[PDB]
Amino acid sequence: QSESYKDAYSRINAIVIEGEQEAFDNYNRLAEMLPDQRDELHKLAKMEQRHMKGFMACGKNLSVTPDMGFAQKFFERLHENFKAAAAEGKVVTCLLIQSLIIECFAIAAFNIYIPVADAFARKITEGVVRDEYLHRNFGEEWLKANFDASKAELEEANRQNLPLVWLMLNEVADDARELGMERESLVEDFMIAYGEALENIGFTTREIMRMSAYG
Ligand SMILES: [Fe+2]
Ligand SMILES: [Fe+2]
């Protein structure tokens, strides 16, 4: 509740709020492109929205106004990349962007946030991190099941959006530090999460190396 933390919390908290609204909208949109799995998607969606409320509460708790503008342009480049794939019915990219890259970013950041969160906030985030492991898994089940048809596009979707997360990660860097998040942990933990995610899908270790290398 000091001067500097709250400021850092105004944008970071805004980032998780925006990420969550966005994640909500993206699952409802995937729902349409993949109708056979529509309502377990719908549930991933309607789940995302209770996260948004969750993280609004943590800001109100500390008595801080989120900076939605910052957040919304924090996310501009990905969302529009997602949207441009939705509009082409390219569902593979939409899954790579949202379920693998976006959730792995979340999984790594929260696990890093929890040990340093002030007490009300580590309660909800432990509550959320449970739920994103499942979101990552869904994108993981689907992609692994269609790996052969999906791989050429996955490869292309990776080089186009993986550079954007690193910019996102480097932007957070400073405001994460004053929240007690050591940037090397963010950096280290997202790559391992994503790398494991790629391997599980059907990518070999050498391939995976090549893909990470676009940051
Ligand atoms: Fe979420
Ligand atoms: Fe999620």
Residue numbers in the entry: 13 to 227
Task: Provide the authors' original text about this structure.
To gain insights into the reaction catalyzed by cADO, we determined structures of wild type ADO from Synechococcus elongates PCC7942 (Se) with different treatment (WT0, no treatment; WT1, co-crystallized with iron; WT-HP, soaked in H2O2), and solved the structures of two SeADO mutants (Y122F and F86YF87Y). SeADO belongs to the di-iron protein family, with conserved sequence of two EX28-29EX2H motifs, in which six conservative amino acids from four helices (Glu32 from helix H1, Glu115 from helix H4, Glu60 & His63 from helix H2, and Glu144 & His147 from helix H5) act as metal ligands.
In the Y122F structure, very little electron density was observed in the substrate channel, which is in contrast to all other four structures. However, there is still a little electron density remaining in the vicinity of the di-iron site, which we assigned to a water molecule forming a hydrogen-bond interactions with the carboxylic oxygen atoms of Glu144 and Glu115. This water molecule is not coordinated to either iron ions, with a distance of 3.28 Å and 3.15 Å, respectively. Apart from harboring the vacant substrate channel, the Y122F mutant shows comparable enzymatic activity with wild type. This result is consistent with that of the equivalent Y135F mutant in PmADO. In the Y122F structure, the di-iron site is surrounded by the four-helix bundle, each iron ion is penta-coordinated by two bridging carboxylates ligands (Glu60 and Glu144), one bidentate carboxylates and one histidine ligand (Glu32 and His63 for Fe1, Glu115 and His147 for Fe2). The coordination geometry of the two iron atoms is similar to that of other di-iron proteins in their rest state of reduced forms which is consistent with the initial state of cADO in the reaction cycle.
